[PDB]
Design an enzyme around this catalytic site. Structure first.
Site, PDB file in Angstrom:
ATOM      1  CB  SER A   1      -1.086  -0.004   1.106  1.00  0.00           C
ATOM      2  OG  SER A   1      -1.994  -1.058   1.122  1.00  0.00           O
TER       3      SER A   1
ATOM      4  CB  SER B   1      -3.962   1.516   4.119  1.00  0.00           C
ATOM      5  OG  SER B   1      -3.200   0.928   3.088  1.00  0.00           O
TER       6      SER B   1
ATOM      7  CD  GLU C   1      -4.500  -2.557  -2.967  1.00  0.00           C
ATOM      8  OE1 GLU C   1      -4.174  -3.749  -2.796  1.00  0.00           O
ATOM      9  OE2 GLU C   1      -3.944  -1.627  -2.354  1.00  0.00           O
TER      10      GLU C   1
ATOM     11  CB  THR D   1       1.482   1.368   6.862  1.00  0.00           C
ATOM     12  OG1 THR D   1       0.083   1.641   6.709  1.00  0.00           O
ATOM     13  CG2 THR D   1       1.963   2.052   8.143  1.00  0.00           C
ATOM     14  N   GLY D   2       2.471  -0.231   4.421  1.00  0.00           N
ATOM     15  CA  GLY D   2       2.081  -1.277   3.485  1.00  0.00           C
ATOM     16  C   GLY D   2       2.179  -2.631   4.164  1.00  0.00           C
TER      17      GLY D   2
HETATM   18  C1  LIG Z   1      -1.890  -2.210   1.652  1.00  0.00           C
HETATM   19  O1  LIG Z   1      -0.610  -2.642   1.987  1.00  0.00           O
HETATM   20  C2  LIG Z   1      -3.138  -3.099   1.991  1.00  0.00           C
HETATM   21  C3  LIG Z   1      -3.836  -2.587   3.269  1.00  0.00           C
HETATM   22  N1  LIG Z   1      -2.983  -1.644   3.895  1.00  0.00           N
HETATM   23  C4  LIG Z   1      -2.644  -1.966   5.076  1.00  0.00           C
HETATM   24  C5  LIG Z   1      -1.554  -1.215   5.784  1.00  0.00           C
HETATM   25  O2  LIG Z   1      -1.243  -1.464   6.884  1.00  0.00           O
HETATM   26  O3  LIG Z   1      -0.974  -0.430   5.131  1.00  0.00           O
HETATM   27  C6  LIG Z   1      -3.679  -2.962   5.659  1.00  0.00           C
HETATM   28  S1  LIG Z   1      -5.004  -1.869   6.303  1.00  0.00           S
HETATM   29  C7  LIG Z   1      -5.301  -2.430   7.971  1.00  0.00           C
HETATM   30  C8  LIG Z   1      -4.362  -1.890   9.010  1.00  0.00           C
HETATM   31  N2  LIG Z   1      -4.011  -3.074   9.757  1.00  0.00           N
HETATM   32  C9  LIG Z   1      -5.182  -3.923   9.607  1.00  0.00           C
HETATM   33  C10 LIG Z   1      -5.030  -5.342  10.176  1.00  0.00           C
HETATM   34  N3  LIG Z   1      -5.512  -5.465  11.588  1.00  0.00           N
HETATM   35  S2  LIG Z   1      -4.321  -6.008  12.548  1.00  0.00           S
HETATM   36  N4  LIG Z   1      -3.810  -7.445  12.056  1.00  0.00           N
HETATM   37  O4  LIG Z   1      -4.741  -6.175  13.950  1.00  0.00           O
HETATM   38  O5  LIG Z   1      -3.235  -4.964  12.505  1.00  0.00           O
HETATM   39  C11 LIG Z   1      -5.319  -3.911   8.152  1.00  0.00           C
HETATM   40  C12 LIG Z   1      -4.127  -3.654   4.341  1.00  0.00           C
HETATM   41  C13 LIG Z   1      -3.463  -4.932   4.041  1.00  0.00           C
HETATM   42  C14 LIG Z   1      -4.065  -3.361   0.777  1.00  0.00           C
HETATM   43  C15 LIG Z   1      -5.263  -4.186   1.080  1.00  0.00           C
HETATM   44  O6  LIG Z   1      -4.522  -2.202   0.184  1.00  0.00           O
END
Ligand SMILES: *C(=O)[C@@H]([C@@H]1N=C(C(=O)O)[C@@H](S[C@@H]2CN[C@H](CNS(N)(=O)=O)C2)[C@@H]1C)[C@@H](C)O
Length: 265
Positions: free
Chosen positions: A42, A100, A140, A209-210
């Site tokens: 991301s 994100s 995505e 973040t990603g």
């Molecule tokens: C991009 O990398 C994807 C999308 N972006 C994310 C990120 O962290 O940048 C996650 S969004 C979300 C934040 N954390 C959540 C998970 N819960 S947890 N395990 O308790 O931390 C997800 C997501 C993958 C892409 C889908 O666009």
């Protein structure tokens, strides 16, 4: 030794770690595996919003975008709440950066337009910023799924740090569009346990973040010392040894950032 510490972290988390901090006035560049390819995940959404901002008048932010059921194909905390009403381009930018949101990224790619659902034009934008390394090939959710080693949908800590530097600190965007991009990253909700966790509270942190398959966990930031000295920090990791379902490990990025912060303080 910084390199020795980064290697320790790699053994601790059974991971591959990439770090880049560009050189400034009086600090040398920090680099660890900085020219190795890592999946964008991301993190591409930061330069995507910049591409969309650059391409249009500022009041394009007020254009309403409509979408439906078959448009929700990935993690989309905001776009799922607004499928009935639509979302403005400004709302989509906000969601792509701060939550994100994956659907928001897809809709913004489509707004940028051209071959590959906007992915060629996205890559073209990075080319215009002197980045000859990075590439976006899919949207995505496919962009997070490429096998380890595959060059599709990759950047490097080095290349993405130089792109972010131009976007936030340099003159890639006019001041008014630069401020919109900066504020969104400043109000990011997803980055508390990554680069933010490695820096003292009196340092300002803005980030994108990603997270992806194969234990992928990234964070790109601009940080400011208590005295207003900025630094760009790119941290990327994957854990290919665990397979497709390898758990991403935020703590690796927090530890890596702590080592970076120690040097810059
Ligand atoms: C991009 O990398 C994807 C999308 N972006 C994310 C990120 O962290 O940048 C996650 S969004 C979300 C934040 N954390 C959540 C998970 N819960 S947890 N395990 O308790 O931390 C997800 C997501 C993958 C892409 C889908 O666009």
């Amino acid at each position: 030794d910084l390199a020795d510490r980064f290697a320790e972290l790699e053994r601790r988390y059974d991971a591959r770690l990439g770090v880049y901090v560009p050189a400034t006035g009086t600090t040398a560049a920090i680099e660890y595996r900085a020219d190795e390819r890592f999946a964008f995940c991301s993190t591409f959404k930061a330069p995507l919003v910049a591409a969309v901002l650059h391409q249009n008048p500022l009041t394009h932010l007020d254009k309403l975008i409509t979408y439906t059921s078959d448009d929700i194909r990935s993690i989309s905390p905001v776009a799922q709440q607004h499928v009935q009403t639509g979302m403005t381009i400004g709302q989509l930018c906000d969601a792509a950066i701060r939550y994100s949101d994956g659907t928001a990224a897809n809709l913004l790619l489509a707004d940028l337009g051209g071959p590959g659902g906007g992915t060629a034009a996205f890559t073209g934008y990075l080319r215009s910023l002197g980045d000859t390394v990075s590439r976006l090939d899919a949207e995505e959710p496919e962009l997070n799924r490429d096998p380890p080693g595959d060059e599709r949908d990759t950047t490097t800590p080095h290349a993405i740090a130089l792109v972010l530097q131009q976007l936030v600190l340099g003159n890639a965007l006019p001041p008014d569009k630069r401020a919109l991009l900066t504020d969104w990253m400043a109000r990011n909700t997803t980055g508390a346990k990554r680069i933010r966790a490695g820096f003292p509270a009196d340092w300002k942190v803005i980030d994108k973040t990603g997270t992806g398959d194969y234990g992928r966990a990234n964070d790109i930031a601009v940080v400011w010392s208590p005295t207003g000295v900025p630094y760009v920090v790119a941290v990327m990791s994957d854990r290919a040894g665990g397979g497709y379902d390898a758990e991403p490990r935020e703590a690796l990025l927090a530890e890596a950032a702590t080592c970076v912060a120690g040097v810059l303080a």
